[PDB]
Design a protein around this nucleic acid. Structure first.
Lengths: 92, 58, 88, 159, 96, 293, 232
RNA sequence: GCGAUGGUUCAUUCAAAUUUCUGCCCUAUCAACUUUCGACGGCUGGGUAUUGGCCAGCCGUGGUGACAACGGGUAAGGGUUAGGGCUCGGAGAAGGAGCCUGAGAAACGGCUACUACAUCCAAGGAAGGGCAGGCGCGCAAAUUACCCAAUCCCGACACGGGGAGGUAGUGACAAUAAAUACUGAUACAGGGCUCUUUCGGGUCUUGUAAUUGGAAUGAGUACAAUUUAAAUCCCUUAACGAGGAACAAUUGGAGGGCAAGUCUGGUGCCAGCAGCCGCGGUAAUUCCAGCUCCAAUAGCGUAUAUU
């Protein structure tokens, strides 16, 4: 459940915060990216509804898992700037 | 036809073929197989034959 | 091309009939060549046991076969038999 | 021929191999390396091709641990052999490090996922272990010889 | 024969069906007629109990016989699309 | 040279024994059996096939069902019931076979029994494995494993590289239309049947319509008496004898023909009506099920 | 719809953008001397990820090219187009490097306000008026009467008028925008006429390499006077 | 005031059309060729978007060629330079003939007539001209899979539409890695093996269908989460998952042993071929109890051509 954010990029014209996320579950099963959306609310002081996570390939041998996370300034900015399939996978 | 439990696995067959061909080798030549034991020298434990010359005559 | 020559001789015989009984209706097409295959036909069988009509189910179908002159004689059939592979 | 049959049987017995395809595989890669060494010996000394390519070949073999660090000449690279390659295999390295009692025990352990090389577990017994990675062969954490759960027959017996 | 490796044939008559000794080569040999060319050649069924699967007028594939009648050159490989050793080993039934 | 070698091998593959055809110019409908273990859905495939062809929703299809599938050829579908007497009766009759396997449950002894009964009696041209109950699966890795193992066992059974169709669901109580459409793509275009010696020497008939033509005075006198029976069907083998043909009604016994009436078809199949366009207009998709609804 | 290798070697694409490449739409700059806005945004700058994201940037009035809002995605922006993004507050400028590829340069409003454009031709337009055509296909009505061919002009870009001009000169440092010696910032030291077609100039760099480039492929940048900030 | 739509001219872009010098492979059983649809000019016009024998009137005498024209054969590369790789490269929409749109076509998209097939009909009439797939013997072997999600394209245009593209399925034709077991203790037997030289020599620990004990599971089953357009695979992964009578290794070759059985030969008892077949018995039998050896081993054999 140990989290680190690399390569955080601002992107104000697309209005969304771009993070390369390296999460680690050692000893656990995989991370459940909806619960990871829940986890990326208090780490960057946001609502859960304006976060979308994709990528998320687990490294060899457990532990490390590289995801890509985007936090939008508003849920409506997420709605007008997100793809349809990522919106369906998120649930909106 | 009916074949063997040894023949159903190609490694175990090649393990048992090597154990019996290393066994056939001790009956022809002489292997080292450790020197004197911890007990010392208990005699030449299987015979001494006097009229036998086992040297490669150059 | 012995295969095609044999098949051509068979087709020559199969043209020689239907060329030879294509000459008359009441004599050849009715009495010589019988009732030709492919045509729908109605059969009247006389003397059927009534248990067939009482136990007739439409599921189990009816196959009508034509016995030859040899298939009505009885006698000792000498056969070449072998048990099945999966019969215990 | 009986010489080839007895040689391949000595290899398959002395290192617990499965068939003669593994022997022929190793003999093919050994013949490729030795052909490269012969082609580099064709040229004269102090040619830059022979110098840098032979230094590359010798450093590669010393780094993968086949050639000894004492002898580093292209003549000894010609004098290389399949017993040295099968000694650098992983299964004989488990047997020689003593995690297993025999070479067939070592093949069994590597197949059913007990040892690990460094970080990740290794499912293949023909893994060519390098010299730097030779020391980090040990039982994995999910193995009952390493720790964690006591295991399968242990669970059925302790119930 | 021909230019091919296997030829087809019709089993005309199992010659030597009344031979006495069981694995005689006269018992094993079978006169077949090749389709492509039309000639009647003789071929060996590989086994005397395997002779029983070869019936009259059956399409028979035959190959060379490479090693009691020295000089019969062919051996029956398949009978009616099914391999004859498979019929003998009771793997397949013969489609007739 | 190798092209000549492969040409010689294929020229030897093309050969067979020169047997006699004995097929008429206006051929009878080819007979399609629907064979399988009990509970596998032979009647459901029958309903789905006749709705594909003639658009008629049969609530209870029994007996042989004749169906126009082309301008030259037509079919007839008979579902074999779950009795061995009917299976052995129809294995010498069938022109093409639709052999049903029950998916997750695997192979059954009735399927293997009919396969080797058919092979011993006489092998027809086309047998198609139809694998059903695929929707009774939870893991689609186990699904493809079961498809692979059932395909390989069927290939060992009849021949290598057969046609094995997979009919997944049951939507409207019938089948999926696309799956039965490709199944009918395979069983619609057709080739002449294999020259079997028994069918090419002996004249047979599969009864489409049955009727009891007996006087009610005879039935009132003797309730269990010898009756006279009108059996209507297509004459399929060689031609019947004009007078005094001996008949084996399979499952009843041997009798003699008292009358043959030779009358025109109920399924005319427009080559016989016009006696070079491809499509079949819906004028031609006739259905002759004189025992079904 | 050209392939990624048939795309020219000076607006770079890696092994990433698929086998295909966008074509530039028709506009002011040429086809083979061009950087489209999608390659500038998402393949060079990486302010975007996808085509739909680039469209969602372009369609709202957030990208201004040469001081005007450019909406369509494959708009050509070849040479020295100031690209103003206001939400990021940056103005990029397109120059070349010494190897022959496109280069981006971040700058603010003071150097973003003007454009150094090379005159293509001077003529007398309709109404009896002289007009001036640059390489950006900008036509300026009533120019200064000495600005001849191959002179460069400081265009105002808020009105579009002339502010200053640099003459074609043997002793004025120049930039090469074509040919086998493409992108080599050096000084024009000689010029040969060759009347009858295709005259040349002889040009040396700051560190003594003489080479002959054609007067079409040259482009005047300033005598010493680097009026645009070449990147240090 | 800011834009959208529209407009004359000049740009610019995207094109298209011609056009200049050099460069095709071979050949003289190809030495004359063009003027045989004008062959070379120049003048005048026509037509073309424009030049032009491109076409029409008038006249002049040409034009090419042994430095290889012309004719004949049909077998139809350029750039990027360590290298290989990478990039680019005429005629028809059933057959001639004529026409229409548009910036761009002599679209073949339409029309008309003729020619040739062919369909519906209430017999007066009316619409229409492709590829893909299977069979191509009577005997056979790669999906009628899913989506524009990425890169790209077209439109009043952020949304609508794309037969490029990407995803999946089969596969012993090859090719790659390697499971079908590992390890002890005890009991008992005294033989095991070899050969040149054989009624002889050589060597010393080997077995057993014996009795027991330990561990190690990956094939498979599988909750999930993840991957992805949605799925699958991969990587993570909780829980099960080994004692042979099984979670069931094959393909060939050589050899021994057997009856109240069968067959054949012949100066008794022998020999040969062989033998699923024997007195009974099929829910009966537990037998060489799984015969011995050699070769390859997830592969292996046969035939023919052969080298």
């Amino acid at each position: 459940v140990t989290l680190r954010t690399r390569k955080f990029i601002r992107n104000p014209l697309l209005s969304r915060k771009q993070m390369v996320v390296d999460i680690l579950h050692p000893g656990r099963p995989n991370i459940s990216k909806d619960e990871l959306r829940e986890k990326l609310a208090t780490m960057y002081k946001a609502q859960k509804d304006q976060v979308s996570v994709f990528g998320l390939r687990t490294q060899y041998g457990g532990g490390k898992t590289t995801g890509f996370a985007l936090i939008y300034d508003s849920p409506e900015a997420l709605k007008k700037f997100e793809p349809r399939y990522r919106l369906v996978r998120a649930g909106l | 036809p009916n074949r063997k439990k040894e023949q159903r696995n190609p490694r175990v067959k090649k393990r048992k073929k090597y154990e019996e061909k290393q066994k056939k080798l001790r009956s022809v030549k002489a292997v080292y197989k450790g020197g004197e034991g911890p007990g010392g020298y208990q005699g030449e434990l299987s015979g001494i034959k006097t009229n036998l010359v086992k040297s490669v005559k150059l | 091309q012995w295969y095609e020559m044999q098949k051509a001789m068979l087709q020559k015989q199969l043209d020689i009939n239907k060329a030879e009984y294509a000459e008359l209706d009441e004599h050849q097409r009715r009495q010589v060549e019988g009732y030709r295959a492919g045509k729908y036909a109605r059969l009247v069988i006389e003397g059927v046991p009534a248990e067939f009509c009482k136990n007739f189910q439409p599921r189990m179908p009816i196959l009508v076969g034509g016995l030859s002159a040899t298939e009505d004689r009885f006698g000792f059939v000498q056969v070449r038999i072998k048990r099945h592979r999966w019969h215990k | 021929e009986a010489a080839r049959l007895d040689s391949e049987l000595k290899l398959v017995g002395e290192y617990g191999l499965r068939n003669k395809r593994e022997v022929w595989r190793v003999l093919l890669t050994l013949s490729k390396i030795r052909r490269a060494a012969r082609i580099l010996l064709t040229l004269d000394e102090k040619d830059p091709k022979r110098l840098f390519e032979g230094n590359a070949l010798i450093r590669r073999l010393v780094r993968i641990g086949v050639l000894d660090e004492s002898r580093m000449k292209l003549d000894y690279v010609l004098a290389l052999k399949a017993e040295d390659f099968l000694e650098r295999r992983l299964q004989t390295l488990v047997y020689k490090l003593g995690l297993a009692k025999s070479i067939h025990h070592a093949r069994v352990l590597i197949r059913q996922r007990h040892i690990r090389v460094g970080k990740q577990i290794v499912n293949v017994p023909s893994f060519m272990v390098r010299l730097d990675s030779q020391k980090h062969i040990d039982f994995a954490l999910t193995s009952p010889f390493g720790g964690g759960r006591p295991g399968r027959v242990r669970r059925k017996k302790a119930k | 024969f021909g230019g091919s490796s296997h030829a087809k044939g019709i089993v005309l008559e199992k010659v030597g069906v009344e031979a006495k000794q069981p694995n005689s080569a006269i018992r094993k040999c079978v006169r077949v007629q090749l389709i492509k060319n039309g000639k009647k050649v003789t071929a060996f069924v590989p086994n005397d109990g395997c002779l029983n699967f070869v019936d009259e007028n059956d399409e028979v594939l035959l190959a060379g016989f490479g090693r009691d009648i020295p000089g019969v050159r062919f051996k029956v490989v398949k009978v009616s699309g099914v391999g004859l050793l498979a019929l003998w080993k009771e793997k397949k039934e013969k489609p007739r | 040279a190798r092209q000549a070698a492969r040409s010689h091998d294929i020229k030897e593959k093309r050969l067979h024994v020169p047997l006699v055809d004995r097929l008429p110019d206006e051929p009878p409908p080819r007979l399609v059996v629907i064979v399988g273990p009990p509970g596998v859905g032979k009647t459901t495939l029958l309903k789905s096939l006749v709705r594909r062809y003639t658009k008629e929703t049969m609530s209870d299809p029994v007996g042989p069902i004749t169906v126009v599938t082309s301008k030259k050829q037509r079919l007839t579908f008979i579902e074999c019931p779950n009795e061995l007497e009917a299976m052995i009766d129809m294995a010498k009759v069938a022109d093409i076979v639709l052999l049903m396997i029950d998916g997750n449950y695997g192979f059954e002894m009735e399927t293997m029994e009919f396969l080797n009964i058919l092979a011993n009696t006489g092998m027809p041209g086309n047998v198609f494995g139809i694998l059903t109950h695929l929707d009774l699966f939870k893991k689609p890795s186990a699904l493809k494993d079961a498809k692979k193992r059932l395909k390989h066992r069927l290939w060992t059974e009849l021949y290598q590289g057969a046609h094995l169709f997979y009919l997944s669901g049951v939507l409207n109580g019938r089948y999926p239309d696309r799956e039965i459409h490709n199944l009918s793509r395979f069983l619609s275009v057709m080739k002449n049947p294999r020259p079997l010696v028994w069918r090419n020497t002996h004249p047979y008939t599969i009864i489409d319509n049955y009727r009891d033509i007996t006087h009610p005075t005879k039935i009132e006198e003797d309730p269990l008496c010898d009756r006279t029976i009108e059996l209507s069907g297509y004459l399929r083998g060689t031609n019947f004898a004009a007078q005094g043909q001996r008949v084996h009604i399979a499952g009843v016994g041997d009798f003699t023909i008292s009358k043959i009436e030779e009358l025109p078809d109920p399924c005319p199949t427009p080559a016989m009506e016009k006696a070079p366009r491809r499509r079949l207009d819906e004028k031609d998709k006739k259905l002759w099920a004189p025992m079904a609804d | 719809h050209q392939k990624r290798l048939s795309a020219p070697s000076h607006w770079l694409l890696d092994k990433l953008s698929g086998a295909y490449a966008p074509r530039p739409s028709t506009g002011p700059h040429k086809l083979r001397d061009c950087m489209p806005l999608i390659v500038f945004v998402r393949n060079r700058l990486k302010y975007a990820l996808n085509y739909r994201e680039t469209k969602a940037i372009m369609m709202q009035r957030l990208v201004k090219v040469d001081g005007k809002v450019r909406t369509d995605i494959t708009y050509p922006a070849g040479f020295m187009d100031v690209i103003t993004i206001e939400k990021t507050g940056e103005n990029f400028r397109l120059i070349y490097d010494t190897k022959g590829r496109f280069t981006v340069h971040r700058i603010t409003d003071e150097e973003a306000k003007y454009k150094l454009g090379k005159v293509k031709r001077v003529q007398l337009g309709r109404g009896g008026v002289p007009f001036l055509v640059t390489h950006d296909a900008r036509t300026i009505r009533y120019p200064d009467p000495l600005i001849k061919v191959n002179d460069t002009v400081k265009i105002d870009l808020e009105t579009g008028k002339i502010t200053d001009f640099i003459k074609f000169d043997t002793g004025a440092l120049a930039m090469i925008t074509g040919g086998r010696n493409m992108g080599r910032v050096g000084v024009i030291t000689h010029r040969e006429r060759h009347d009858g077609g295709f005259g040349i100039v002889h040009l040396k760099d700051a560190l003594d390499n003489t080479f002959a480039t054609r007067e079409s492929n040259v482009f005047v940048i300033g005598s010493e006077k680097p009026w645009i900030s070449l990147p240090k």
